Design goal:
Two copies of one chain form a homodimer. Chain A is 46% helix and 7% strand. Chain A is mainly α. Chain A has a single domain, classed as MDM2. Chain A has a two-stranded antiparallel sheet with strand order 1-2. Bound molecules: the ligand Cc1c(Cl)ccc2c(/C=C3\NC(=O)N(Cc4ccc(F)c(F)c4)C3=O)c[nH]c12 (2 copies). One copy of the ligand Cc1c(Cl)ccc2c(/C=C3\NC(=O)N(Cc4ccc(F)c(F)c4)C3=O)c[nH]c12 sits between chains A (28, 31-32, 35-36, 46, 49, 67, 70, 73) and B (32, 35-36, 41, 46-47, 49, 67). Chains A, B: It is found in: Nucleus. Chains A, B: This is Protein Mdm4.
């Protein structure tokens, strides 16, 4: 089981998660939710996430990532779920 | 506002919608959910919706569409709303 730190719960909750303990599938569904509802992906680079000045970005530290290559976010997730 | 038809009413509900009437975009937005959660998009081709055999397929009439060129179910709402 995974209890994230506040900041990511923050993206997390904000995509309608509830609570503190979680799974990794679950942590991946809400971050997807978030990107989809925040509509953060690129209308023309459909796999590219643009989260400049957006709290994901904050948490990832990049302004962009590709989902076709998800590493930098794993290193977010490798970093953030206790 | 729009009265979605059962077979599209089928698909909305599958991604946790409820009711009989919905706006365009909540609607636009459940399809969004159906597709995300069911992984209808191709992981390499992310703007690409691989849906044959799925309810969505035939209701689109099809086996995919380009989420860049949505006219099939922009067309499939227009005949399935309301
Ligand atoms: C990378 C990534 C993550 Cl993580 C999460 C969501 C997305 C994503 C989402 C969408 N692209 C799109 O065009 N729509 C609107 C849409 C809805 C239903 C239709 F049937 C339809 F044709 C069009 C989207 O929801 C594109 N990349 C993503
Ligand atoms: C076209 C279209 C429609 Cl219509 C609806 C949804 C999508 C879509 C969604 C995803 N692609 C992806 O790789 N994930 C996983 C994911 C989870 C958490 C993250 F943080 C993340 F970066 C990536 C997705 O959820 C990609 N194209 C779509």
């Amino acid at each position: 089981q995974v209890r994230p730190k506040l900041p990511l719960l923050k993206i997390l909750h904000a995509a309608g998660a509830q609570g503190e303990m979680f799974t990794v599938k679950e942590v991946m569904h809400y971050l997807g939710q978030y990107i989809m509802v925040k509509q953060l992906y690129d209308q023309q680079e459909q796999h590219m996430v643009y989260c400049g000045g957006d709290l994901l970005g904050e948490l990832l530290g990049r302004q962009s990532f590709s989902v076709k290559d998800p590493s930098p976010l794993y290193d977010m997730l490798r970093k953030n779920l206790v």
